[PDB]
Design a protein around this ligand. Structure first.
Ligand code: VZ6
Ligand code: VZ6
Lengths: 193, 193
């Protein structure tokens, strides 16, 4: 089983594709509660995930992934094993002491990037979204009221909103009108570069 | 608290919008395990949902909703209560003996329909999808290989795939190329008209 890091040129369009990884196998990583890195065991966090993406050859690969808590500093490519000793992933993304476990995970977004853009945001708890912006509900409501009369044009930009209680994806046309929204009912964080 | 059925002309763009319902309140229906209809109690099904949508004024309102199991025949608009006696929803969609509980639910899709289409499919367990079609994995892989060289155009059609283990939404351009995919990691059924 082989795992190649996108950050080091490892994308291969004929292999399984996950955020940060091209692999010869497709592991369902939702099932693990404990993993091992350099013979140290780490617990998977319950009920909170990490929204991770890689962008390679004009292809966006994004998903909500399990994460484990680790006070050691780990680096891209470090092999991640199950407790039986099999390698199941590699280190890819981190948020402080949380490390993503990349593989088949929770909700996902795959997208052809040619002709569009995509942006990621931390969603403040209690805020509302319209289109490309977040703000207080009453501010957003006023914005939505103004944009209601516009005729919807083609999607040109994607906005990913990652919150403690909900995640969502919005899309806009060139005039800023919201065209489509999807909501994922899970809480998560974004990686910190 | 008022609940108006979209099937009977009840859409109101200034009220909370859920599949089949415009309401003066926004109830989180994920929390209920038991509901009441005409003073009979019904259990909510665990770990399996119903993908429901209404299409009103060129607006698509779709979501994965809890469902309860009921051997009585119920009709659109029948009031659904919590066990404290408060009305929390109305009957909207059914799949045999399953009835959707519409409100704030699980994963959702909101979409402006002007200029695009949308279609719903039962996803056969074990099948793969590309674009507007499902089939056996090796058939779909051959299709994807043919379409790989095409340049992505604007989204014109949405396809909703509802399976026992996963739900997904794909989008295509006028040439049938897949532009974007979202996956929801929950199992569900579609309503039966
Ligand atoms: N070589 C093969 N690889 C994979 N599946 C294969 C293969 N041969 C046959 N099949 C069958 O085909 C269907 C379609 O699966 P599909 O790839 O559409 O997506 C699936 C589903 F959303 C979910 C469970 O699906 P499952 O119930 O297992 O059904 C499968 C399976 F029965 C996991 C997800 N998933 C799989 N791989 C990747 C990946 O690389 N990236 C991102 N997500 C991935
Ligand atoms: N009058 C108000 N109504 C609603 N929220 C209000 C209001 N005033 C202030 N707020 C705050 O604003 C944010 C943005 O919520 P938003 O509407 O974006 O979507 C939310 C989230 F995805 C999820 C939990 O969000 P929550 O943590 O409660 O945060 C809220 C809240 F703090 C439920 C979902 N949801 C709410 N209503 C509907 C609806 O009618 N249809 C479909 N989904 C709906």
């Amino acid at each position: 089983a082989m795992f190649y890091a996108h950050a080091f040129g490892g994308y291969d369009e004929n292999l399984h594709a996950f955020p940060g990884i091209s692999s010869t196998v497709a592991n369902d990583v939702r099932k693990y509660s404990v993993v091992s890195v350099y013979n140290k065991k780490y617990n998977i966090v319950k009920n909170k995930y990490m929204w991770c993406n890689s962008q390679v050859n004009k292809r966006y690969i994004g998903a909500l992934l399990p994460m484990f808590e680790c006070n050691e500093y780990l680096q891209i490519g470090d092999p991640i094993h199950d407790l039986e000793g099999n390698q199941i992933s590699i280190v890819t993304y981190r948020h402080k002491n949380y490390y993503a476990l990349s593989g088949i995970g929770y909700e996902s977004l795959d997208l052809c990037l040619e002709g569009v853009g995509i942006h990621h945001h931390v969603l403040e708890t209690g805020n509302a979204v319209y289109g490309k912006v977040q703000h207080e509900y009453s501010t957003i409501k006023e914005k939505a009221k103004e944009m209601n009369a516009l005729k919807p044009g083609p999607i040109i930009d994607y906005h990913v909103w990652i919150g403690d209680c909900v995640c969502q994806v919005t899309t806009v046309d060139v005039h800023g009108k919201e065209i489509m929204r999807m909501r994922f009912k899970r809480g998560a964080v974004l990686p910190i570069p």
